[PDB]
From a paper:
Within each TTSS a conserved, class II chaperone protein is required to prevent premature association of translocator proteins while maintaining them in a secretion competent state, ready to be presented in a temporal fashion to the TTSA. In the enteric pathogen Shigella flexneri, invasion plasmid gene (Ipg) C is the class II chaperone for invasion plasmid antigens (Ipa) B and C. Owing to this central role in supporting translocator function, IpgC is essential for Shigella virulence as an ipgC null strain is noninvasive. Furthermore, upon release of the IpaB and IpaC effectors, IpgC binds to the AraC-like transcription factor, MxiE to promote expression of late-effector genes. Two reports describing high-resolution crystal structures of two class II chaperones have provided a great deal of insight into the structure and function of these all alpha-helical, tetratricopeptide repeat (TPR) proteins.
Author numbering:
A (entry chain A), B (entry chain B): 18 to 154
């Protein structure tokens, strides 16, 4: 039988002050270089609240360091759909499409950041990438 | 719309050699004193394979240090139901019921370990607790 029992036996709901504390550790383990450990905290956060741009961006940033570019890119796709005209995710999907050796999709991602973004610093990165592509093709 | 896309986009299934590596970190963070960080790795493992005695015992051991005794005890309940006559979980449910200041339930847990367990070392702990209860009531 096993059953489950006279129980409780949750209540998986996690308090918000703890959901945030989890993010904090996810960031720390990221910064402090310990990647595979931070991939958990993120994969966890996404399992709970998947429509959070901050959590998706985190996870995607990890699949990108782990060099699993296809996955990181599909995630950035969503981070940008939840993206109220935030073009950061599109820039990185550019970096990814580049390492996936498909530079036509890559060129479009950067061209697109330049045309619609209001992040003056990001437009600079994105333009700088375009320039560096045609500089030794 | 958002959609999800041309994707994959898992595939949450985690390789077994990684599920084990996650346990390993959960233990390390536990031993190395960093509790709240280990509570995640465990809460994660239970989210995946909840019918694992090792994972449940881990999480319960953490709720018990975090002094959330009621939750720790409900988990031990299950760790023992999956428990092929392993009475360790019942011993701790005794420690918990004690801090929940309900010493009648506590006395029964220990008496029960004494009567059915084959862990000679455990039977000594369980008996010593009983003796220490009536020694200054």
């Amino acid at each position: 039988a096993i059953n489950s029992g006279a129980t409780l036996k949750d209540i998986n709901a996690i308090p918000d002050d703890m959901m945030d504390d989890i993010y904090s550790y996810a960031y720390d383990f990221y910064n402090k270089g310990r990647i595979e450990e931070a991939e958990v905290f993120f994969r966890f956060l996404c399992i709970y609240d998947f429509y959070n741009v901050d959590y998706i961006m985190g996870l995607a940033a990890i699949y990108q360091i782990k060099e699993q570019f296809q996955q990181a890119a599909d995630l950035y796709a969503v981070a940008f759909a939840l993206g109220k005209n935030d073009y950061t995710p599109v820039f990185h999907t550019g970096q990814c499409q580049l390492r996936l050796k498909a530079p036509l999709k890559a060129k479009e991602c950067f061209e697109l950041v330049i045309q619609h973004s209001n992040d003056e610093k990001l437009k600079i990165k994105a333009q700088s990438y375009l320039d560096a592509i045609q500089d030794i093709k």
